[PDB]
């Protein structure tokens, strides 16, 4: 009944990779694969140099292309907006990896697809995700989008600007980048070459 979301204030992100390492420890994510990673890009020339530190992970899209594509039904979207995988029905076919626009998904060495989970295991015991917990810069917030006392809700309200990766896709990403450092918005590789 709530709508779960994450917001990252890029004006404060320094791209130390604490959240990324906190995730790997908690969810014991295996070597070679990542639920969360950081992307750092410069937009250039001296008087006007800009560096964007951007953590990336499952955005738990509100209209996820990775769910419909699943033959088994292991890829499901929850009543509060988490996209999860039930490994019991997963046939490790990769259809969801093909349909995910963000590279958030991987094949776990135990034979099923995995990805960030919004720390489902903590959300039920009433705790905040591990990446949100460790953050030194206080730049990431979480909560129910519909509850206006939520740390995501209050941050979205305070942001000067709000962006999302590949909005042109169908998805409705529920991970919001707040104050993007470059005036043109979130950095893209086509805007370099």
């Amino acid at each position: 009944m709530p709508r779960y979301a994450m917001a990252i204030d890029l004006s404060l992100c320094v791209g130390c990779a604490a959240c990324a390492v906190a995730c790997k420890m908690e969810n014991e994510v295996p070597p070679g694969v990542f639920n969360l990673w950081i992307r750092e890009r410069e937009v250039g020339e001296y008087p006007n140099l800009v560096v964007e530190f951007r953590p990336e992970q499952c955005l738990h899209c509100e209209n996820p292309p990775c769910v419909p594509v699943c033959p088994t039904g292991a890829s499901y979207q929850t009543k509060d907006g988490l996209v999860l995988v039930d490994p019991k029905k997963c046939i490790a076919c990769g259809a969801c990896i093909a349909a995910c626009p963000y590279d958030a998904r991987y094949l776990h060495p135990a034979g099923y697809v995995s990805k960030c989970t919004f720390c489902a295991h903590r959300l039920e015991k009433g705790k905040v995700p591990a990446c949100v917990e460790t953050c030194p810069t206080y730049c990431r917030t979480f909560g129910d989008l519909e509850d206006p006392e939520s740390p995501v809700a209050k941050a979205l309200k305070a942001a000067e600007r709000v962006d999302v990766l590949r909005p042109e896709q169908g998805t409705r990403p529920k991970l919001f980048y707040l104050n993007a450092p470059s005036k043109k918005g979130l950095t893209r590789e086509s805007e370099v070459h």
Binding site: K89, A99, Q169, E189
Partner: protein
């Protein structure tokens, strides 16, 4: 441009899932030949119905063999859930009901030639699903709408190529007709992509691409060159599009 950790942008369907792509082309194409040969009353309707059952079964084995989830036996769910939005789901049943149906037809029982109508339908589902399993991913620039056309055309070039090598009189002409349709759409494909997607395609494959286009022009010369040259062209293109399109790219 620089990362701490890495996006999971690694190839997800390897040379083995490119091999299955080629076989399900054959499996679905031959299952179409079989039902049509039935429906038509042809003496050969049996020979081709037991081939399609082997090709279908070979593929369904390669499908489980190459799956990291094989010894976890999770495939039973492919048949215990309703998931109409999923190209792959439609191909599990299309090749499954297409098998039973081809069994009840080879063991001459149950029913006759009302069953060839069901085999025709299931073969169209099996010919249609890969092509859409790629095109459904609108985030992959190379896998555009033409995949839904390039794969069924190319699966029939495979079925008719096989048929013509097993010297069936009827197979050569339609193989050279669908091979012309196949090769002309394959040539137009690059011209259909945005400039960055096309550039990616020509640097990653192409030669390979322009090789298989040239090679395929061999279906229109001699015999026992013809079915071969059209068969290597159809499987080239099929495997290369699965391999080169796993790009997300900006």
């Amino acid at each position: 441009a620089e990362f701490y950790g890495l996006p999971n942008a690694q190839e997800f369907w390897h040379w083995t899932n490119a091999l299955h792509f080629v076989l399900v082309g054959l499996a679905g194409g031959v299952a179409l030949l079989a039902a049509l040969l039935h429906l038509k009353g042809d003496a050969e309707a049996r020979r081709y119905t037991l081939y399609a059952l082997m090709l279908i079964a070979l593929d369904l084995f390669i499908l489980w063999a190459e799956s990291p989830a094989r010894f976890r036996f999770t495939h039973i769910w492919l048949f215990l859930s309703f998931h109409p939005t999923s190209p792959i789901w439609w191909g599990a049943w299309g090749l499954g009901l297409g098998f039973l149906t081809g069994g009840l037809l080879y063991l001459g029982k149950g029913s006759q030639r009302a069953l060839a109508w069901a085999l025709l339908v299931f073969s169209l589902v099996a010919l249609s699903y890969p092509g859409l399993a790629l095109a459904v991913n609108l985030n992959r620039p190379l896998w555009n709408g033409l995949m839904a056309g390039l794969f069924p055309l190319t699966a029939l070039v495979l079925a008719l190529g096989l048929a013509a090598l097993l010297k069936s009189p009827w197979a050569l002409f339609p193989l050279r007709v669908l091979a012309g349709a196949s090769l002309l759409l394959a040539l137009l494909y690059p011209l259909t992509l945005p400039p960055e997607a096309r550039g990616h395609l020509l640097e990653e494959a192409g030669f390979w691409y322009g090789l298989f286009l040239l090679l395929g022009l061999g279906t229109f010369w001699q015999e026992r060159l013809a079915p071969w040259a059209g068969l290597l062209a159809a499987a080239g293109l099929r495997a290369l599009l699965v391999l080169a399109g796993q790009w997300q790219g900006l």
